[PDB]
Amino acid sequence: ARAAFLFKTVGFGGLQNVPINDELSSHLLRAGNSPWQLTQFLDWISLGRGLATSALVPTAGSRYYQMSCLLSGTLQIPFRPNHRWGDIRFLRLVWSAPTLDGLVVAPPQVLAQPALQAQADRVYDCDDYPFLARDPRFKHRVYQQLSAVTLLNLTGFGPISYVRVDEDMWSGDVNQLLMNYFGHTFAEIAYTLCQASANRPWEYDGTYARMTQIVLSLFWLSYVGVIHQQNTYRTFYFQCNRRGDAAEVWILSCSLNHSAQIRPGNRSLFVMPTSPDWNMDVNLILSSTLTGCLCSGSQLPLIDNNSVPAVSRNIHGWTGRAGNQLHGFQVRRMVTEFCDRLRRDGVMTQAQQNQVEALADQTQQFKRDKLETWAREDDQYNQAHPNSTMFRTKPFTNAQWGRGNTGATSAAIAALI
Amino acid sequence: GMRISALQSLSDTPSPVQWLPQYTIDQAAMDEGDLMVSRLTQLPLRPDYGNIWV
Amino acid sequence: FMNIQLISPIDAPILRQWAEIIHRYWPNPSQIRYGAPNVFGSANLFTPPEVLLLPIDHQPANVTTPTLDFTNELTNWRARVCELMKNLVDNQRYQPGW
Amino acid sequence: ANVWGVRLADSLSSPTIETRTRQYTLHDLCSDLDANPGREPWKPLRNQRTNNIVAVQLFRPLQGLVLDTQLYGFPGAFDDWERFMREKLRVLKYEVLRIYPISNYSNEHVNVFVANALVGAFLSNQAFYDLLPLLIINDTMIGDLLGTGASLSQFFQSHGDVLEVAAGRKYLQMENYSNDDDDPPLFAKDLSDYAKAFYSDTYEVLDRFFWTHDS
C-alpha cells in the first residue's frame, strides 16, 4: 500500500510561462469543462486504429502533453498556502467548486484583476489541501490521473512503464478473467481496465491489479521477441502481423505449441522510450496510463536519483537514494532486436526480416519529418506572438534521435524470463 | 515561548489578608485616577458601624 | 423537552419519567451494505456508495431455524411503554370511578 | 493564555516515565473471579453532598455489559449487588476450572475479549459454552477471532480482516442516581451501545475499511 501522495508539475521549455495559452485550453474544453481529461483522451485516439491528427493537436503525445500542461498550470491556485480556490484566475479560467469539478470563464470583476503567475517544476502534496484530505475516495480518484501526469513529467523523455514477472500472481480468478480477453487488442483491454479503475479503486492484491500487471508483462515480453506463438507463457501471447508500421495492432492469443520454462521468484523493472517516435505510438502511452492507474492502489519500488534530472530528485515516494534505474530504448533499433531474436529462435527467415526493416525505415522517415516541421511552426508562432508563447508537443533535441542503451534494455527484458 | 514548570499552588483560606503597596516612578493625572475608581467603585452600601468606645 | 430541570419532579413525575424514557431508550440508526458497483456503479448523492441507511439497528441471524427471542430492540421499547402505562393506571387518583 | 473562555497558566509539565505491559493469564482470571479480599474488580462512587454511594466503576473481567439492565437482574442497593456479583462469579469460576485444569494451563495467556463476553453472557444467562474453547489464546489475540467464523453476533463479528466489537459499559448506575448537581457525571458510558470498536493489525486496512463505511 501507499502512504505518500506527492506529484510533480510540468517545467517551462525556456518560455516565461506554462506552455499553454487560451486557444489550446478552449480546444481541450470544447466538449467538457472538466480538467480531468483521461476519458476524453480515450475517445480521441480512436482505439489506435489510425494516425489521429488535428490542427492544434497534431499527435496523441501532443494531447497528452497539453493535458499535463493544463493541470500543472491550473492546480497551483488551490495549492497556495492560503488554500483559496475562487479568488483568482489562470488564463481567463476559474474553478467551479471547492471540490475541483470543472473550469468556467472568470466573472468580470476577476477578469479586471490580474492572473496568477505559475512556476516551473513544482512538487505538491495532496494532503495539504483540506478538501482532498477530508474525502479519501475523491483523493484516490484524482491521484490516479496525477500519477499519470507525474510519470510523464518525471524526466525529459517519453512515458515510463513498469514490468513485473512473478509466478504467485496467477490464481483461479485471474485465469477465469484472463480467458475472456482472448482475441482482443491491447487498446480494448486498456480501455476496459481504465474504466473499471475509474469506477472503483482497486485493493492492494485484488484480481484487477494482478490482471493488469500480467497484461503489461505479456505485452512487453512479446514486444521484445522472447515470447511468440511457438514459445508461449502459459499459452498466452501477443501477435502483430504488421510489425514496423505507423499504427501497429497487437492481439492477445492462445496457443498450445509450447510453454516456456519460467524461473521462480519475483522480478521487475522500469522501461521507457527516448526517441520522439513515442508521440505517435499509442500502445506505449496506454501502457504508461495503466501503470499510472495502478499506482494509486499499490506502492512501486523507488527510482534512483541518478537516472532523473536534478530538480526531480528525492521526491518522497517516487525517487530515492539507491532505487532501480530506468531502462531507455528507441523504437527503430528495437525492431531489429525483435527480428534478430525471432530469427535466432528459428521461426523467421532473412527475406521477411528484410521486408520488416524496410517498412520500419519508411515509417521512421515519415515520423521524423513531420515532427521537425511541427517544431519549426511552433518556433515561428512563438516569435510572432510574444503574449501567447505556447508549445504543441513536448520539446526534444536532435541527440535524442540516436540509439542508446537499447541493447541493454532488450537484454534485461529477455533476462526477466 | 514557554517554560517547563509544574502548576504549584496554595489552598483556600477563609480570612482577608494584609497588603502593603510599592510605588514606581510612573506618573498619571489625578483626575484620571479618580475617574476609574468611581467606575470600579462598589458603593453605595450600608456597613456595620461598630463601637466608638470600649 | 431539551433539559429535564424545567420539569418539576414533584408536580409532574409521570412526564419526567416519560421524557427520560424517550431520551435514553429511543431506537438507534444503522447502516447496511448493498449493490455491486463494479458494473452498476451507484447513484448515492449524499451518502457514500454501497451504503443503505436505516432508522432501526440491524443485527444478522446466526441460525437458519429461528425460535422466539425478546432481546430485539422493538420488544424493549414496548416494555418501557407498558411499565409507564402501569404507573399512571395504579394511581389512586385515577381509580375512584373504577 | 486565553483559549475562548478557558484560561491557561503559562507553564508546561508532562510525564516523562512510562510503565510496562503485563499479559493476562488464567491465574489472574481466577484471582479476579475470587474477589475474596478488597481486590474486587470494581470500585464505588459516592455523592458529594449526602455521602451515599450512587454508582460503580467496572474493571478487567466486568467490562462486558452491553444488553439492557433488566436482563441482568441486578438489585437496587449496593450491598445486595455486591453479594450477587460475588455469588455469580464464584459459580462461574468453578465452571471455568472444570474445563481447564489448573496445573496444566497455569502458564498460558487468556483472550481478553472472550473473558469479558463470557462474564457478560454468564450474568445474562446466554449460552456461554461456545466461548469457553476460546478462553486460551493459541496463535494471536485478533487472529483467533478472525479465523473463527462460528461465533455469536451478540459480542463480535468479522468484516474481512477487521474485527468489530461492541464496547461494554464502564459505569453502572445504582438506585440513588437522581441526576443531582453532586451526582458524578458518567459521560454516556452507562448506556447500552454507546460506541463500536474496530480492531486490526495495520491502520492502513482500518482506514481503507472506513472508506466504504459511513463516518
Short mmCIF file of C-alpha atoms in Angstrom, two decimals, chain D residues 47-193:
data_model
loop_
_atom_site.label_atom_id
_atom_site.label_comp_id
_atom_site.label_asym_id
_atom_site.label_seq_id
_atom_site.Cartn_x
_atom_site.Cartn_y
_atom_site.Cartn_z
CA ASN D 47 -22.26 11.54 46.23
CA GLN D 48 -20.50 14.74 47.28
CA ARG D 49 -23.40 16.12 49.36
CA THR D 50 -25.16 13.19 51.06
CA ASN D 51 -22.05 10.96 51.04
CA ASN D 52 -24.08 8.00 49.79
CA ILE D 53 -22.99 5.65 47.01
CA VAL D 54 -24.69 6.18 43.66
CA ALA D 55 -22.71 4.24 41.03
CA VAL D 56 -19.98 1.67 40.41
CA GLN D 57 -16.99 1.54 38.03
CA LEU D 58 -16.10 -1.76 36.35
CA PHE D 59 -12.76 -3.43 35.61
CA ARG D 60 -10.93 -6.15 33.68
CA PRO D 61 -13.39 -9.09 33.58
CA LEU D 62 -16.51 -6.98 34.20
CA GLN D 63 -16.30 -4.75 31.11
CA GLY D 64 -18.87 -6.60 29.02
CA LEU D 65 -22.37 -5.47 29.96
CA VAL D 66 -23.90 -4.43 26.63
CA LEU D 67 -27.50 -5.65 26.95
CA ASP D 68 -30.14 -3.61 28.75
CA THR D 69 -30.02 -3.56 32.53
CA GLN D 70 -33.21 -5.50 33.31
CA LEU D 71 -31.87 -8.64 31.62
CA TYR D 72 -29.11 -8.87 34.24
CA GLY D 73 -31.38 -8.94 37.29
CA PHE D 74 -29.38 -6.58 39.49
CA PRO D 75 -30.68 -5.35 42.86
CA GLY D 76 -31.12 -1.65 43.52
CA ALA D 77 -28.92 -1.44 46.61
CA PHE D 78 -25.13 -1.55 46.77
CA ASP D 79 -24.56 -4.30 49.34
CA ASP D 80 -27.04 -6.64 47.66
CA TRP D 81 -25.38 -6.00 44.29
CA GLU D 82 -22.00 -6.83 45.84
CA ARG D 83 -23.37 -10.10 47.23
CA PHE D 84 -24.95 -11.03 43.90
CA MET D 85 -21.72 -10.43 41.99
CA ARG D 86 -19.68 -12.43 44.48
CA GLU D 87 -22.04 -15.41 44.24
CA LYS D 88 -22.27 -15.49 40.45
CA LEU D 89 -18.54 -15.06 39.97
CA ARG D 90 -17.91 -17.88 42.46
CA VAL D 91 -20.09 -20.25 40.43
CA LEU D 92 -18.53 -19.19 37.11
CA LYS D 93 -15.02 -19.73 38.49
CA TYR D 94 -15.66 -23.43 39.10
CA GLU D 95 -17.44 -23.77 35.75
CA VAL D 96 -14.24 -22.46 34.13
CA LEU D 97 -11.91 -24.61 36.25
CA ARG D 98 -13.88 -27.69 35.19
CA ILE D 99 -12.70 -27.27 31.59
CA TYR D 100 -9.13 -26.05 32.17
CA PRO D 101 -7.04 -27.99 34.73
CA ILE D 102 -5.06 -25.59 36.90
CA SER D 103 -1.74 -27.46 36.88
CA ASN D 104 -1.81 -27.82 33.09
CA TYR D 105 -2.89 -24.36 31.92
CA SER D 106 -1.34 -22.18 34.64
CA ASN D 107 1.41 -20.72 32.43
CA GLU D 108 -0.70 -19.57 29.46
CA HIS D 109 -2.41 -16.38 28.34
CA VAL D 110 -6.12 -15.56 28.15
CA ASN D 111 -8.14 -13.95 25.34
CA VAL D 112 -9.49 -10.82 27.00
CA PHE D 113 -12.44 -10.32 24.63
CA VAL D 114 -13.61 -13.84 25.43
CA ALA D 115 -13.29 -13.28 29.18
CA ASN D 116 -15.44 -10.14 29.08
CA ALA D 117 -18.01 -11.76 26.78
CA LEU D 118 -18.12 -14.93 28.87
CA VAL D 119 -18.71 -12.99 32.09
CA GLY D 120 -21.46 -10.92 30.48
CA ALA D 121 -23.18 -13.94 28.94
CA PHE D 122 -23.00 -15.85 32.23
CA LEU D 123 -24.67 -12.97 34.05
CA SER D 124 -27.35 -12.56 31.37
CA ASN D 125 -28.00 -16.34 31.09
CA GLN D 126 -26.98 -16.75 27.47
CA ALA D 127 -25.39 -19.85 26.01
CA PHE D 128 -21.83 -19.32 27.24
CA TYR D 129 -20.44 -22.79 26.44
CA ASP D 130 -19.41 -21.65 22.96
CA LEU D 131 -16.98 -19.04 24.30
CA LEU D 132 -15.14 -21.47 26.60
CA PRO D 133 -12.85 -23.08 23.96
CA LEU D 134 -11.73 -19.56 23.05
CA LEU D 135 -10.59 -18.73 26.59
CA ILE D 136 -6.93 -19.61 25.84
CA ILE D 137 -5.06 -17.76 23.10
CA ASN D 138 -3.41 -20.13 20.62
CA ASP D 139 -1.98 -18.07 17.74
CA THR D 140 -2.90 -14.40 18.14
CA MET D 141 -5.46 -12.42 20.11
CA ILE D 142 -7.00 -10.91 16.97
CA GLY D 143 -6.26 -13.81 14.63
CA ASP D 144 -8.19 -16.40 16.62
CA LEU D 145 -11.38 -14.35 16.50
CA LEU D 146 -10.78 -13.60 12.81
CA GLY D 147 -10.37 -17.27 11.90
CA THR D 148 -13.44 -18.42 13.82
CA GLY D 149 -16.43 -17.95 11.55
CA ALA D 150 -18.65 -19.83 14.01
CA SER D 151 -19.27 -17.26 16.74
CA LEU D 152 -22.07 -15.22 18.26
CA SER D 153 -23.10 -11.85 16.83
CA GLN D 154 -24.11 -10.70 20.33
CA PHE D 155 -20.47 -9.78 21.04
CA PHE D 156 -18.21 -9.59 17.99
CA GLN D 157 -18.23 -10.11 14.22
CA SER D 158 -15.83 -10.07 11.28
CA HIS D 159 -15.74 -7.87 8.18
CA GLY D 160 -12.99 -9.47 6.13
CA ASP D 161 -9.83 -8.56 8.03
CA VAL D 162 -11.48 -6.21 10.56
CA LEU D 163 -12.92 -7.34 13.90
CA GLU D 164 -15.98 -5.41 15.06
CA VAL D 165 -16.59 -5.48 18.81
CA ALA D 166 -19.30 -3.92 20.96
CA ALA D 167 -17.93 -1.50 23.55
CA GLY D 168 -19.04 -2.51 27.04
CA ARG D 169 -20.25 -0.42 29.94
CA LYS D 170 -17.74 1.41 32.13
CA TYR D 171 -20.13 2.70 34.81
CA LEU D 172 -23.15 1.00 36.37
CA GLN D 173 -25.85 3.25 37.81
CA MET D 174 -27.31 2.31 41.20
CA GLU D 175 -30.72 3.26 42.56
CA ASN D 176 -29.78 6.66 44.00
CA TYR D 177 -28.71 8.49 40.81
CA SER D 178 -31.21 11.36 40.70
CA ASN D 179 -29.21 13.44 38.19
CA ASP D 180 -28.14 15.65 41.11
CA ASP D 181 -25.74 18.58 40.93
CA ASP D 182 -23.40 16.41 43.02
CA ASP D 183 -24.13 13.15 41.21
CA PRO D 184 -20.92 12.25 39.37
CA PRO D 185 -21.00 12.51 35.57
CA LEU D 186 -20.95 9.16 33.79
CA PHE D 187 -20.00 10.62 30.37
CA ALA D 188 -22.50 8.48 28.44
CA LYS D 189 -20.65 5.24 29.21
CA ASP D 190 -23.58 3.81 31.21
CA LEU D 191 -25.69 3.26 28.08
CA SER D 192 -26.42 0.06 26.16
CA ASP D 193 -24.44 0.66 22.94
#
